[PDB]
Design a protein around this motif. Structure first.
Motif, PDB file in Angstrom:
ATOM      1  N   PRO A 198       0.799  -1.009  -0.061  1.00 26.74           N
ATOM      2  CA  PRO A 198       0.152  -0.030  -0.452  1.00 26.74           C
ATOM      3  C   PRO A 198       0.785   1.159  -0.088  1.00 26.74           C
ATOM      4  CG  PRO A 198      -1.763  -1.448   0.663  1.00 26.74           C
ATOM      5  CD  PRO A 198      -0.676  -2.291  -0.042  1.00 26.74           C
ATOM      6  N   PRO A 199       1.569   1.424   0.773  1.00 25.00           N
ATOM      7  CA  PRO A 199       2.258   2.825   0.044  1.00 25.00           C
ATOM      8  C   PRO A 199       3.175   2.623  -0.701  1.00 25.00           C
ATOM      9  CG  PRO A 199       2.438   2.056   3.220  1.00 25.00           C
ATOM     10  CD  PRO A 199       2.084   0.972   1.772  1.00 25.00           C
ATOM     11  N   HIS A 200       2.387   2.694  -1.696  1.00 26.69           N
ATOM     12  CA  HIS A 200       2.598   2.315  -3.160  1.00 26.69           C
ATOM     13  C   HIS A 200       4.120   2.964  -3.464  1.00 26.69           C
ATOM     14  CE1 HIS A 200       0.089  -0.836  -3.417  1.00 26.69           C
ATOM     15  NE2 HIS A 200      -1.547  -0.157  -3.600  1.00 26.69           N
ATOM     16  N   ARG A 201       5.504   3.210  -2.994  1.00 29.23           N
ATOM     17  CA  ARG A 201       6.211   3.556  -3.365  1.00 29.23           C
ATOM     18  C   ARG A 201       7.057   3.180  -4.619  1.00 29.23           C
ATOM     19  NH1 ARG A 201       6.665   0.984   0.924  1.00 29.23           N
ATOM     20  NH2 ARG A 201       9.429   0.669   1.421  1.00 29.23           N
ATOM     21  N   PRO A 202       7.975   4.600  -5.438  1.00 28.95           N
ATOM     22  CA  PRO A 202       8.410   4.013  -6.468  1.00 28.95           C
ATOM     23  C   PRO A 202       9.664   2.166  -5.966  1.00 28.95           C
ATOM     24  CG  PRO A 202       9.602   5.980  -6.285  1.00 28.95           C
ATOM     25  CD  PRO A 202       8.130   5.797  -5.123  1.00 28.95           C
ATOM     26  N   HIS A 203       9.691   1.394  -6.638  1.00 30.46           N
ATOM     27  CA  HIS A 203      10.501   0.194  -6.445  1.00 30.46           C
ATOM     28  C   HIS A 203      11.864   0.955  -7.169  1.00 30.46           C
ATOM     29  CE1 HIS A 203      12.036  -3.730  -5.921  1.00 30.46           C
ATOM     30  NE2 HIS A 203      10.487  -3.993  -5.890  1.00 30.46           N
ATOM     31  N   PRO A 204      13.028  -0.243  -5.930  1.00 36.08           N
ATOM     32  CA  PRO A 204      14.264   0.084  -6.164  1.00 36.08           C
ATOM     33  C   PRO A 204      14.533  -0.424  -8.052  1.00 36.08           C
ATOM     34  CG  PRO A 204      14.333  -1.416  -4.866  1.00 36.08           C
ATOM     35  CD  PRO A 204      12.870  -0.161  -4.554  1.00 36.08           C
ATOM     36  N   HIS A 205      13.863  -1.354  -8.362  1.00 37.56           N
ATOM     37  CA  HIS A 205      14.082  -2.427  -9.886  1.00 37.56           C
ATOM     38  C   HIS A 205      13.812  -0.895 -11.049  1.00 37.56           C
ATOM     39  CE1 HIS A 205      14.773  -5.320  -7.147  1.00 37.56           C
ATOM     40  NE2 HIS A 205      14.177  -5.549  -7.665  1.00 37.56           N
ATOM     41  N   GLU A 206      14.314  -1.353 -11.686  1.00 39.35           N
ATOM     42  CA  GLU A 206      14.419  -0.720 -13.537  1.00 39.35           C
ATOM     43  C   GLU A 206      13.545  -1.773 -14.524  1.00 39.35           C
ATOM     44  OE1 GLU A 206      17.396   1.437 -14.485  1.00 39.35           O
ATOM     45  OE2 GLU A 206      18.945   0.751 -12.743  1.00 39.35           O
ATOM     46  N   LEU A 207      12.525  -1.456 -14.814  1.00 37.50           N
ATOM     47  CA  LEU A 207      12.106  -1.472 -16.390  1.00 37.50           C
ATOM     48  C   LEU A 207      12.705  -1.180 -17.009  1.00 37.50           C
ATOM     49  CD1 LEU A 207       8.752  -0.477 -15.883  1.00 37.50           C
ATOM     50  CD2 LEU A 207       9.227  -2.676 -15.968  1.00 37.50           C
ATOM     51  N   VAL A 208      13.583  -1.709 -18.158  1.00 34.76           N
ATOM     52  CA  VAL A 208      14.449  -1.691 -19.408  1.00 34.76           C
ATOM     53  C   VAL A 208      13.849  -2.845 -20.463  1.00 34.76           C
ATOM     54  CG1 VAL A 208      16.171  -1.966 -17.527  1.00 34.76           C
ATOM     55  CG2 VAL A 208      15.055  -4.347 -18.219  1.00 34.76           C
ATOM     56  N   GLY A 209      14.336  -1.850 -21.705  1.00 34.21           N
ATOM     57  CA  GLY A 209      13.993  -2.612 -22.473  1.00 34.21           C
ATOM     58  C   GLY A 209      13.680  -1.073 -24.059  1.00 34.21           C
ATOM     59  N   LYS A 210      12.832  -1.612 -24.531  1.00 30.11           N
ATOM     60  CA  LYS A 210      12.179  -0.168 -26.188  1.00 30.11           C
ATOM     61  C   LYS A 210      11.181   0.329 -25.318  1.00 30.11           C
ATOM     62  CE  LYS A 210       9.343   0.334 -30.256  1.00 30.11           C
ATOM     63  NZ  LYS A 210      10.471   0.898 -30.533  1.00 30.11           N
ATOM     64  N   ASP A 211      11.687   2.323 -25.585  1.00 30.28           N
ATOM     65  CA  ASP A 211      11.031   3.452 -24.865  1.00 30.28           C
ATOM     66  C   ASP A 211      11.609   3.238 -23.430  1.00 30.28           C
ATOM     67  OD1 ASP A 211      11.058   4.307 -27.774  1.00 30.28           O
ATOM     68  OD2 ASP A 211       8.790   2.788 -27.258  1.00 30.28           O
ATOM     69  N   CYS A 212      12.123   2.285 -22.567  1.00 31.47           N
ATOM     70  CA  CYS A 212      12.682   2.689 -21.682  1.00 31.47           C
ATOM     71  C   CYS A 212      13.891   3.830 -21.446  1.00 31.47           C
ATOM     72  CB  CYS A 212      13.133   1.356 -20.427  1.00 31.47           C
ATOM     73  SG  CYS A 212      11.244  -0.077 -21.061  1.00 31.47           S
ATOM     74  N   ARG A 213      13.797   4.577 -19.821  1.00 33.87           N
ATOM     75  CA  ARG A 213      14.815   5.223 -19.551  1.00 33.87           C
ATOM     76  C   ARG A 213      14.204   5.045 -17.961  1.00 33.87           C
ATOM     77  NH1 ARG A 213      12.618  10.207 -20.383  1.00 33.87           N
ATOM     78  NH2 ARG A 213      14.101  11.676 -19.347  1.00 33.87           N
ATOM     79  N   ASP A 214      15.452   5.405 -16.895  1.00 35.19           N
ATOM     80  CA  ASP A 214      15.289   5.841 -15.827  1.00 35.19           C
ATOM     81  C   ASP A 214      14.540   4.962 -15.018  1.00 35.19           C
ATOM     82  OD1 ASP A 214      17.496   7.598 -16.676  1.00 35.19           O
ATOM     83  OD2 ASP A 214      16.456   9.245 -16.329  1.00 35.19           O
ATOM     84  N   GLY A 215      15.049   3.828 -15.734  1.00 33.93           N
ATOM     85  CA  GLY A 215      14.198   2.309 -14.706  1.00 33.93           C
ATOM     86  C   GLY A 215      11.819   2.502 -15.233  1.00 33.93           C
ATOM     87  N   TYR A 216      12.184   3.688 -16.333  1.00 34.63           N
ATOM     88  CA  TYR A 216      10.628   3.920 -16.701  1.00 34.63           C
ATOM     89  C   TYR A 216      10.507   2.778 -17.950  1.00 34.63           C
ATOM     90  CZ  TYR A 216      11.294   8.149 -17.056  1.00 34.63           C
ATOM     91  OH  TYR A 216      11.437  10.037 -17.608  1.00 34.63           O
ATOM     92  N   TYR A 217       9.087   3.019 -18.740  1.00 32.50           N
ATOM     93  CA  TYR A 217       9.478   2.814 -19.688  1.00 32.50           C
ATOM     94  C   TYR A 217       8.180   4.320 -20.069  1.00 32.50           C
ATOM     95  CZ  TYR A 217       6.083   1.359 -24.122  1.00 32.50           C
ATOM     96  OH  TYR A 217       5.028   1.541 -25.607  1.00 32.50           O
ATOM     97  N   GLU A 218       8.018   5.071 -20.997  1.00 32.11           N
ATOM     98  CA  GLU A 218       7.486   6.200 -21.651  1.00 32.11           C
ATOM     99  C   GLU A 218       7.493   5.815 -22.941  1.00 32.11           C
ATOM    100  OE1 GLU A 218       6.997  10.395 -18.947  1.00 32.11           O
ATOM    101  OE2 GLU A 218       8.403  10.235 -20.376  1.00 32.11           O
ATOM    102  N   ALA A 219       5.794   5.687 -24.025  1.00 33.02           N
ATOM    103  CA  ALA A 219       6.574   6.829 -25.615  1.00 33.02           C
ATOM    104  C   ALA A 219       4.637   6.997 -25.457  1.00 33.02           C
ATOM    105  CB  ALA A 219       6.688   4.227 -26.110  1.00 33.02           C
ATOM    106  N   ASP A 220       4.816   7.215 -26.200  1.00 33.41           N
ATOM    107  CA  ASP A 220       3.469   7.932 -27.458  1.00 33.41           C
ATOM    108  C   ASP A 220       2.344   7.251 -27.464  1.00 33.41           C
ATOM    109  OD1 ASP A 220       4.967  11.319 -27.564  1.00 33.41           O
ATOM    110  OD2 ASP A 220       5.800  10.440 -29.607  1.00 33.41           O
ATOM    111  N   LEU A 221       1.701   7.528 -26.908  1.00 37.28           N
ATOM    112  CA  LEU A 221       0.394   6.557 -26.894  1.00 37.28           C
ATOM    113  C   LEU A 221       0.322   6.580 -28.506  1.00 37.28           C
ATOM    114  CD1 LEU A 221      -1.812   5.719 -25.006  1.00 37.28           C
ATOM    115  CD2 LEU A 221      -3.334   7.766 -25.278  1.00 37.28           C
ATOM    116  N   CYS A 222      -0.640   5.610 -29.710  1.00 31.32           N
ATOM    117  CA  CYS A 222      -0.930   5.253 -30.575  1.00 31.32           C
ATOM    118  C   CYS A 222      -1.815   5.685 -30.517  1.00 31.32           C
ATOM    119  CB  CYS A 222      -0.869   3.637 -30.918  1.00 31.32           C
ATOM    120  SG  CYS A 222      -1.665   4.352 -32.496  1.00 31.32           S
ATOM    121  N   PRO A 223      -2.289   7.309 -31.647  1.00 34.61           N
ATOM    122  CA  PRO A 223      -3.424   8.243 -32.002  1.00 34.61           C
ATOM    123  C   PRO A 223      -4.732   7.426 -31.802  1.00 34.61           C
ATOM    124  CG  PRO A 223      -1.771   8.194 -33.420  1.00 34.61           C
ATOM    125  CD  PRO A 223      -1.705   7.624 -32.794  1.00 34.61           C
ATOM    126  N   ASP A 224      -4.568   6.098 -33.560  1.00 37.38           N
ATOM    127  CA  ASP A 224      -5.647   5.428 -34.147  1.00 37.38           C
ATOM    128  C   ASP A 224      -6.252   5.050 -32.447  1.00 37.38           C
ATOM    129  OD1 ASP A 224      -4.831   6.597 -36.769  1.00 37.38           O
ATOM    130  OD2 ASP A 224      -3.116   5.482 -35.954  1.00 37.38           O
TER     131      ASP A 224
END
Lengths: 275, 275
Positions: free
Chosen positions: B64-90
DNA sequence: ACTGGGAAATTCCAGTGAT
DNA sequence: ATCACTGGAATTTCCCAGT
């Protein structure tokens, strides 16, 4: 004069300790050391009795015989080698507190540099050779005795190598041990399924080896039947004689084909298969 | 209020968290209903909007106190341990095929938490004086953070939505329970039969074998000493509900982890009538 | 103060399945 | 063929128990 090893070190069962384990390694025992009585690596100098010193260091198992990145630790050890006086009265000398401290792979180059810097290179191997891969699970002791000549100048005798000492974490050279077995009797026709729990083995280099007076067979299984290096599901081989009249005691043991090491034997009884 | 809906949750167990040393990219988190013939991925649907925008996915704590986790997301469009990309408009439905979980070392934990704060990776805006308690490094939740546009193109930050927790398959304690093999799958209804069972890694302090029928519940008998290198158990079957069993009955046999009550796939066992 | 040993944490790697 | 990925094994660290 020259040095001979009277009591070789025991090859197996010793665990190399890392520096992160701040506790110093064990004491290497001699071949003939038994759980009852404790022998120790022992040399004898033929051709001289009197004042002298000995240095013991680690070198590689295989023939260039370059200084090993690991360290001897214990009393009278520094920079990964042992050094102290011989007794001038005796010509036989033993070493009761030799421990092996393994260095990590990332600290290898630093370790090798220390060997050179401390002039720890018994066979004066060129630095060209010393960028080869090292076996970190095996070492040889190297005995380097210095006696006095008739004028009382130090005389350095030829270095003698021990047999290899193996880290018992290494499965390829460890002791073979059967811990638990679900069945110790079977049909003389063979094909009884056995679950066997053992210490760590390599699935590509292990067999179960049944023996009798002038007989040998192997349990049947694949590499898939070896579970996580510590269990083997196999089927017993048929016994020499297909029509036993009465039970026949044979031995069952683990065997490693690479070096032909055997485990301690266990009693297995082949039973007459009269239904 | 436009909002994010999870169409395809992530599969909770099965996948390892990977260290940086194991390489760039840490596989792809699969969807709940992923199979070998039909591989699915975590999917969301944006209800009440279509057009351009952004989605960020980050890791948060399971509890419950949902703090950011020390682990990282990695892969396509990931940086600084998080994923971030443009939403598909269609399209209004979006799925993520290259999400990997990269676990940080215990040594680098304080540094990782510091990166999360520095990068403004704190979806629930937890104060820093909570970011110091014990983190469960074995479990994370995905946090989907979608930003759409109002009619004049100003960013509207939708409510953050949480996934089910994802557990590290490699970590003992959170590894998936599995009965690989067994020497027998039948025995007396009275019990006392010795079973050699081969399993994936379990903790001997936190494991039991669980017999179940309709309105019945029992456990195999063994000591911690009978768990062999975490991947085999030798135990005795419990007595069946009824010791006056007339003809055979099939029960389920599975590994259970009391601490979190997780179970293996059931394996059939049949209680036979005592002769 | 030291010793024997199991296992958690981290790293490596041989052999696949997706393309 | 390439190589991202899977899962077993090896390496390194930590910890408990007992004298």
């Amino acid at each position: 004069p020259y040095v001979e090893i009277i009591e070789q070190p025991k090859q197996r069962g010793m665990r190399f300790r890392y520096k992160c384990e701040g506790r110093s390694a064990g004491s290497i025992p001699g071949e003939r050391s038994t759980d009852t009585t404790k022998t120790h690596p022992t040399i004898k100098i033929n051709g001289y009795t009197g004042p002298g010193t000995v240095r013991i260091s680690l070198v590689t198992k295989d023939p260039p015989h370059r200084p090993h990145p690991h360290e001897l630790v214990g009393k009278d050890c520094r920079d990964g080698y042992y050094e102290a006086d011989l007794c001038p009265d005796r010509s036989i000398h033993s070493f009761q507190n030799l421990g092996i401290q393994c260095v990590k792979k990332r600290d290898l180059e630093q370790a090798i540099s220390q060997r050179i810097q401390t002039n720890n290179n018994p066979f004066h191997v060129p630095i060209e050779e010393q960028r080869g891969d090292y076996d970190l699970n095996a070492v040889r002791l190297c005995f380097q005795v210095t006696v006095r000549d008739p004028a009382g100048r130090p005389l350095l005798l030829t270095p003698v190598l021990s047999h290899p000492i193996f880290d018992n974490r290494a499965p390829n050279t460890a002791e073979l041990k059967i811990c638990r077995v679900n069945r110790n009797s079977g049909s003389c026709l063979g094909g009884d399924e056995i679950f066997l729990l053992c210490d760590k083995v390599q699935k590509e280099d292990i067999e179960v080896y049944f023996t009798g007076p002038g007989w040998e067979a192997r349990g049947s299984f694949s590499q898939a039947d070896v579970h996580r290096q510590v269990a083997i599901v196999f089927r017993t081989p048929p016994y020499a004689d297909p029509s036993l009249q009465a039970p026949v005691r044979v031995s069952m043991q683990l065997r490693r084909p690479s070096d032909r090491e055997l485990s301690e034997p266990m009693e297995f009884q082949y039973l007459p298969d009269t239904d």
